[PDB]
Design a protein around this motif. Structure first.
Motif, mmCIF file in Angstrom:
data_model
loop_
_atom_site.group_PDB
_atom_site.id
_atom_site.type_symbol
_atom_site.label_atom_id
_atom_site.label_comp_id
_atom_site.label_asym_id
_atom_site.label_seq_id
_atom_site.Cartn_x
_atom_site.Cartn_y
_atom_site.Cartn_z
ATOM 1 N N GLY D 86 0.781 -1.095 0.084
ATOM 2 C CA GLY D 86 -0.040 -0.065 -0.016
ATOM 3 C C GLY D 86 0.807 1.267 0.025
ATOM 4 N N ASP D 87 0.256 2.471 -0.247
ATOM 5 C CA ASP D 87 1.256 3.746 -0.151
ATOM 6 C C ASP D 87 1.609 4.028 1.242
ATOM 7 O OD1 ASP D 87 -1.740 4.226 -0.122
ATOM 8 O OD2 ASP D 87 -1.721 6.019 -1.497
ATOM 9 N N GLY D 88 0.437 4.024 2.017
ATOM 10 C CA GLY D 88 0.808 4.277 3.707
ATOM 11 C C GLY D 88 1.908 3.358 4.039
ATOM 12 N N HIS D 113 0.384 0.120 -4.329
ATOM 13 C CA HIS D 113 -0.825 0.416 -4.761
ATOM 14 C C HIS D 113 -1.268 1.883 -3.937
ATOM 15 C CE1 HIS D 113 -2.130 -3.922 -4.763
ATOM 16 N NE2 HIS D 113 -1.043 -3.906 -4.657
HETATM 17 MG MG LIG Z 1 -3.226 2.720 0.283
#
Ligand SMILES: [Mg+2]
Ligand SMILES: Cc1ncc(C[n+]2csc(CCOP(=O)(O)OP(=O)(O)O)c2C)c(N)n1
Ligand SMILES: Cc1ncc(C[n+]2csc(CCOP(=O)(O)OP(=O)(O)O)c2C)c(N)n1
Ligand code: SF4
Ligand code: SF4
Ligand SMILES: [Mg+2]
Lengths: 301, 627, 627, 301
Positions: D86-88, D113
């Motif tokens: 994920g980006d986070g 993502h």
């Molecule tokens: Mg994300």
């Protein structure tokens, strides 16, 4: 008790940085009681302890100075918060927090002691040492590429990015002053000989190579209008990769137009600058002064 | 009265909101509620369910059975039929739906359903569930939700997809109808929840249709409410207590079920304050969303250094990441509170479920010896007062304080009397704070009680360091300084142990030969179990530890001497609270009732577990009900 | 014989190397050694010192006194004079140097020196130290190191700055002279250590000058060495044991005193191997220097998933950062060993000093319940066999194993018989490993003993997840799967506890009414203390726990029944090993001898502490000697 | 037991990425048993579990996939190791490990993502969301500047940097293939709608803006000789900041001339490629096959 033995190796570049930082703080006239130097773990990290002035020191955890500094500055924004970290500390283990500071643009200055090594643990390669380099402390050539602290800072994006040199104290002093006054997050990557480990990137090696961007006619790294910002940023990026025979020193980029984190807090907390957490009166004779009446009322049946 | 209502449905259909409306109606009629929220680690499509206990008296615990199950899908029937005792509301459209066609259902649950049905020779359709339920005297009320939705769409001249969510309010209106309370409370609850005229009116029609299609079975009367009541969840109550306790900096990284606490603080961060000479001022709590938990702990610790009351909140994975920072706070004698929303672990574990499996880790978090003050709340009111307490303990003993609030409490909500959290003074004790008399202050003066005089950044030159240090905060390896400074810090815990009355560290209820030894969230179920058992001859007492460090060693030795049954009841496998008693006193529990499945322990699980121990002395009762 | 030699000097002067040369000479003469290294968190200029115990028999522990102190500066005199019993070698140039002019000296140490001198009316000069020492019958031998260095410079026609470091070998040559062993052993030790002809020859002259200026006092004879002897430190021995145990991946982040282990592995990473049909192959250990400890733990855990035997090494701050990763390894049942070089804590603490203050944290590291197998080595030979054991335990129980090696052992070195680490088979047990019979393998099959059949990445489709999971490794929240899978993992510890003989978890020496209950590094000092006390009527036994989890509960209850004195001896404040006994069995130690100053516990500290407990029953003896 | 409910919100961009990644693996013909997908925590992180093929999944800790992947790949370099974060996860908590991968140039592909949010924890701003942006999930405008994953990756320096789009599956598929074949560390930043949270950066918003660098005549991001490297890198940097009306997608930079970490290990371990840790025979009938004789001999008195 009273003495602190300044225990750095004779001829360490850290002496120059200390001298320069003290002088920056004096010449700016800032009350020393209000200055907090937050430092990491390594030779670098010992710096607040060796300070002449009545500044405060907060010697933290390995790579965690920026997080401490953030809590300190946001709780009491009248403090002048300066962070001193080693290159391993700041850019190795602390990398994540280093980058996230750029997104917040908190009004802090970050001074990276860039010696190419982990001095305090006997000179393993730092994240600034180039691949293939073999200092006297390394059994084999460095297996890792270096990161360019200035390029990571720009991509992060720090709003003041500069590089100094520990053996040009007057220049370094003036950079530290500007990094402190800059309204936002400022980086000064400081080239700093470690004579004990790193017999490559020595004093004589740098003396021979460094030139000042200040002596480049028309070099202007200051963003004054929003439309200048992209060109100033790309000109900073390009310059930040100059390395072999010529090494630039000075200010690569400065944009005081981006709101500080403190400016953004003020949008949600309108009196933050006048009644910040650390100024607030939370009790009178041991009885809380906080009203939660309305909070409780909202939950009534 | 004690009636257990449940509704359920796919996450993303606003069924949580439907449950809220139901409860809000019943409450305005003068009934107390205890409600729960059970979701998957999932944004849409998994099965969620919402249990609401209804009573004229305060309620303390959930139940293993459902009086009324409200449903509009197949899955909610399949997931709860074995617990359903009196009434099922269901959708006749799925009568022929077989458990294998419910694709959102975990394969393990499909197997449990087939097993329970096969066992008495039933097949696997909803229709077979209906027979299962009629064999147990359950009454079923089948609705053509499609026709009712067509009718409403028609009335409002919109397409069916506009009014599809009215299914929820048909299920709710029929449930509320069975109770027999007057429609206006529900009508009001619908109008205060939805925000546009059309949605109000078609949901109101949906609820009418449900209400008028069912008989008044429970014949409930209304109660006038004397003392002012509130309805709050655990998260929110911790936030209220912290704010009442003077918190002005919180840093956090999002994690379930801790995030809601910080989101509430931030939404309410500009607080009214009555300050010097009765002036109204507003004071802001700075709330920072850190980039990770290492930033979150260290931000809060840095903030505390300025004299602000600071905290964070987290759960297992985050708390593991904070270990280092907590150790640094121990070494530098920094007040900070860490609210530990304890959940299903190890690793990611059950991010949306509960547990008590991290207590001994909390007691021993991070390297070195230093005072880790640890408390745990057992119900919603305790959460409020415990958060004030944590913050006072942290400043009084200049050390990290860990306030455990299990997920079960965090996400559950209850109705109780407002005065329970307003009736006493909100005390703020700042500990050994002084005004420095010069430019240089020795932060770590070695005193007899271990607690060094404290000053804040900006007041005088002070030094903190992760290294061992002298009285000035400078790096010192000297053996004799080390001896003194290391002892001074640990002596603070002995001072705490002399200063905090042991009676404040435990709640004792009853006086009997059979002890229910617990901590945290089982408190409620245990007290409700004790009342039931008492009516049947079986005499029990509860000993609920609130403060594990410093541990109430002498009080516990006194209360447990000569007891013949000591039954530890905890949501973990190793009965960690019992293990701590044993370390501190030598006393071993005789029996255990344990649950590690993530779902709250119910009143009936405790009653039956204790009967099972009295009747046959089994060593470990293992619970598993719910979800 | 038992002679204690010490030399010291500013870090950066190669005094460690001088100590090595001294020891190497004495050893070739047939004496056993036990040596230590004591440094500051500092690269240059602080005071370092090097103690070497010399004996014709194996040596097990250090001492509180020094027979011969060798010095060439003022500071080394000031730092050790109170411990010096028989001979001081010193530099006459500093006779008038006062303790206040030694700027590299911590202020606290300057105060301790002034106090010890003032106390008997002496001033603060070296000359006053000489009188202090003559009042105690110490003989002092003063050298004009400047003249001797001028002489050598002259002889070799170089400037004085070229030969300045010969001061070290004058101090060494005079020390070695006092012993009376023949010069050739020292001459040989100089020639094998230095790498250029000029340095060899002028250091050889420096040592001659020292040797020929002093009388033969100890009259030591040479011993023929029968069985082959080796000289090794703790770090190195752990590395050897791991390599013998099949380690082929180690990831680490540098930290003292753990780094040396990985640096040695890497320098020797291409190993000879006798493989199938007696073929000589080389096999490389991949060693990665991670960017931080979170990367280090998780790299090693990922590696283990491929079937490699993997490990890391760390110390307190790093170990705190690894908590999360260890919890994930517990959840996913991943074999990994974590070598915990336990040091002076909390936080940065004493990065160059030792401690035992992190045991209970290790026992409870990270969120959730899962088997944390924990062992601790008590001497150098145990380190080797314990590292093989850790690796077998990890694969047999599919879980993280924590191998504690205190700093005291890590950095100390000893001479012992080579056969102690070669005489038995190097056993590698891979546990429940199988060849998958299709494309999809269920990694977490639920069995009665808790241990699921294991396959490696690349052999079949498998799944690992931090979330709770079914037998296939897919995310599963179902209550009944949760019940089973969570129990299965914890049942592995009970299986371990049935399978590992309790006798392998403790070393018991003697049979007496007074128990010395310990673990780790005090083993040596205790055994040497028991021998001395035995000669004086005082009968003691040692009980040394090696495996804390699973804890040898029944064996400990049996050995300690009816004992009247149980004295816990540990390098921590809370006697954490005693606390674990108390948790597991109800047995409380009667008395304590504790040290938290970071320096090794000495033979004499134990002797005197025990006398002090027999003579006046004091509850806690607190030690503080060294450095 | 046998079914895995693919539990993503209907119309999630994650369906496109899954479809594209499966197809990349098939079309390359790689034996699926040898493919390991290492994924983080979030909606993104669930992806290996939903895969059709007999690949293996290793679902890790929040932000730690790269560290796991590194241990996996270096122990058994015959595995094809792909990381989905994920980006986070990848750029927030995992930032430090994200950057350090670039220095190592391990042969792995990293697929980020990029939905702008933390989907799984109810849509807090991710490190890619711009300052001032207010999705339906945010009570107030985002207080944080975004980081440009491509610029951080370049400064780090990843040797293959690309951006894809989840709603151009064929294009994304072809990028994933090239990221997998690339000899070194490869990033594909994948633009990915989250319809549940993030009603700004939707499918229709992107459809309107994305253009292919593949359709730019003479756009050549491949370094073929060392002297090309700096110009190719600066051209990548410039492009990586194009954002408002035009959003480039495609390969920004590729340099297969930099040695991989595996190439550097081979310098110190000469038979690593033939007898890597996971292939090694460490025992015969329960008796160690490792000789430490010479090690012990070196310590003799
Ligand atoms: Mg994300
Ligand atoms: C979590 C953690 N891991 C490891 C260490 C050990 N350590 C202390 S300083 C240091 C490296 C210092 O290098 P740098 O940050 O470059 O500072 P320098 O000594 O070169 O100024 C290390 C690895 C620690 N204190 N904490
Ligand atoms: C150490 C830790 N802290 C917090 C969490 C809670 N958590 C799980 S997923 C997530 C964010 C997911 O966002 P992203 O990585 O952008 O993935 P997405 O859901 O948007 O695909 C968080 C905060 C955790 N698992 N571990
Ligand atoms: S080691 Fe390098 S950095 Fe540390 S003090 Fe000595 S010279 Fe300065
Ligand atoms: S929340 Fe956003 S990201 Fe997570 S599944 Fe639903 S849509 Fe996809
Ligand atoms: Mg450095």
């Amino acid at each position: 008790r009273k003495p602190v033995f300044v225990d750095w190796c004779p001829g360490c570049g850290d002496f120059g940085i200390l001298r320069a930082e003290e002088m920056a703080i004096r010449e700016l006239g800032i009350n020393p009681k209000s200055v907090v130097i937050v430092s990491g773990i390594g030779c670098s990290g010992k710096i607040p302890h060796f300070m002449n002035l009545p500044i405060s020191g907060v010697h933290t955890l390995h790579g965690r100075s920026i997080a401490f500094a953030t809590g300190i500055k946001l709780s009491n924004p009248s403090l002048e918060v300066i962070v001193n970290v080693g290159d391993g500390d700041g850019l190795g283990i602390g990398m994540g927090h280093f980058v996230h500071l750029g997104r917040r643009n908190i009004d802090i200055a970050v001074l990276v002691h860039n010696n190419g090594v982990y001095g305090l643990t006997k000179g393993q390669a730092s994240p600034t040492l180039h691949r293939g380099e073999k200092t006297k402390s390394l059994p084999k050539p460095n297996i890792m590429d270096a990161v360019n602290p200035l390029a990571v800072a720009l991509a992060a994006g720090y709003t003041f990015v500069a590089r100094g040199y520990a053996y040009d104290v007057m220049h370094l002093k003036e950079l530290i002053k500007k990094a402190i006054l800059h309204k936002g997050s400022a980086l000064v990557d400081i080239l700093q000989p470690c004579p004990t480990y790193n017999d490559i990137n020595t004093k004589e090696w740098y003396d021979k190579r460094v030139y000042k961007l200040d002596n480049v006619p028309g070099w202007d790294p200051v963003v004054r209008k929003e439309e200048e910002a992209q060109k100033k940023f790309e000109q900073a990026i390009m310059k930040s990769y100059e390395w072999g025979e010529k090494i630039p020193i000075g200010i690569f980029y400065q944009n005081e137009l981006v709101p500080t984190f403190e400016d953004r807090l003020t949008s949600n907390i309108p009196n933050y600058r006048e009644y910040y957490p650390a100024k607030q009166q939370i009790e009178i004779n041991g009885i809380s002064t906080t009203k939660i009446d309305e909070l409780i009322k909202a939950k009534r049946i | 009265t004690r009636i257990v209502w449940m509704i359920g449905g796919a996450q993303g259909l606003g069924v949580d909101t439907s449950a809220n409306i139901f409860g809000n109606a019943v409450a305005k009629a003068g009934y107390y509620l205890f409600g729960n929220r059970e979701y998957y680690s999932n944004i849409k499509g998994r099965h969620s369910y919402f249990e609401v206990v209804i009573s004229e008296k305060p309620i303390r615990s959930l139940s293993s059975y459902v009086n009324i199950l409200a449903s509009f899908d197949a899955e909610t029937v399949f997931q709860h039929f074995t617990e359903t005792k009196e009434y099922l509301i269901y959708n006749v459209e799925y009568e022929n739906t077989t458990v294998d066609l419910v694709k959102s259902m975990e394969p393990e649950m499909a197997e449990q359903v087939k097993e329970a049905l096969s066992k008495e020779r039933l097949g696997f359709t909803i229709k077979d569930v209906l027979e299962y339920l009629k064999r147990r005297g359950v009454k079923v009320i089948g609705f053509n939700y499609t026709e009712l939705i067509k009718k409403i769409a028609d009335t409002f001249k919109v397409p069916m997809s506009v009014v599809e969510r009215a299914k929820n309010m048909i299920a709710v209106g029929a449930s509320y109808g069975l109770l027999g309370l007057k429609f206006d409370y529900l009508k009001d609850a619908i109008s205060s929840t939805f925000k546009n005229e059309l949605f109000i009116k078609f949901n109101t029609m949906a609820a009418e249709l449900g209400y008028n299609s069912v008989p008044n079975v429970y014949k409930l009367q209304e109660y006038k409410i004397e003392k002012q009541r509130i309805q709050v969840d655990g998260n929110t109550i911790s936030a209220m207590g912290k704010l009442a306790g003077g918190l002005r900096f919180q840093s956090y990284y999002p994690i379930t079920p801790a995030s809601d606490e910080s989101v509430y603080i931030e939404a309410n961060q500009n607080l009214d304050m009555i300050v010097e000479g009765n002036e109204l001022r507003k004071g802001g709590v700075v709330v920072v969303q850190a980039e990770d938990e290492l930033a979150a702990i260290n931000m809060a610790v840095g903030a505390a250094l300025t004299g602000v009351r600071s905290a964070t909140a987290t759960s297992g994975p985050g708390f593991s990441l904070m270990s280092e920072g907590i150790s640094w706070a121990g070494m530098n004698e920094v007040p900070v509170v860490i609210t530990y929303y304890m959940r299903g672990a190890p690793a990611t574990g059950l991010p949306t479920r509960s547990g008590q499996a991290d207590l001994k880790f909390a007691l021993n978090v991070g390297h070195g010896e230093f005072p880790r003050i640890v408390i745990a709340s057992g119900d919603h009111v305790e959460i409020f007062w415990d958060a004030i307490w944590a913050l006072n303990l942290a400043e009084k003993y200049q050390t990290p304080v860990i306030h455990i609030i299990e997920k079960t409490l965090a996400n559950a909500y209850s109705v109780f009397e407002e005065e329970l959290i307003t009736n006493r003074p909100y005390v703020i004790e700042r500990g050994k704070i002084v005004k420095p008399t010069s430019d240089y202050f020795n932060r770590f003066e070695v005193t007899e009680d271990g607690i060094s005089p404290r000053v804040f950044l900006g007041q005088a030159s002070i030094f903190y360091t992760g290294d061992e240090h002298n009285e000035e905060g400078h790096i010192t390896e000297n053996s004799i300084n080390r001896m003194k400074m290391y002892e001074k810090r640990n002596k603070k815990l002995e001072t705490a142990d002399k200063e905090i009355p042991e009676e404040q560290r435990v709640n004792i209820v009853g006086d009997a030969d059979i002890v229910l030894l617990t901590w945290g969230s089982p408190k409620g179920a245990i007290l409700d179990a004790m009342e039931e058992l008492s009516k049947d001859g079986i005499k029990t007492m509860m000993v609920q530890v609130k403060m594990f460090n410093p541990y109430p060693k002498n009080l516990m030795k006194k209360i447990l001497s000569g007891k013949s049954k000591i039954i530890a009841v905890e949501n973990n496998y190793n009965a960690q609270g019992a293990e701590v008693l044993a370390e501190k006193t030598g006393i071993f529990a005789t029996n255990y009732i344990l649950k590690w499945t993530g779902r709250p322990i119910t009143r009936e699980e405790v009653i039956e577990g204790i009967k099972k121990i009295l009747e046959r002395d089994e060593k470990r009762v293992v619970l598993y009900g719910g979800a």
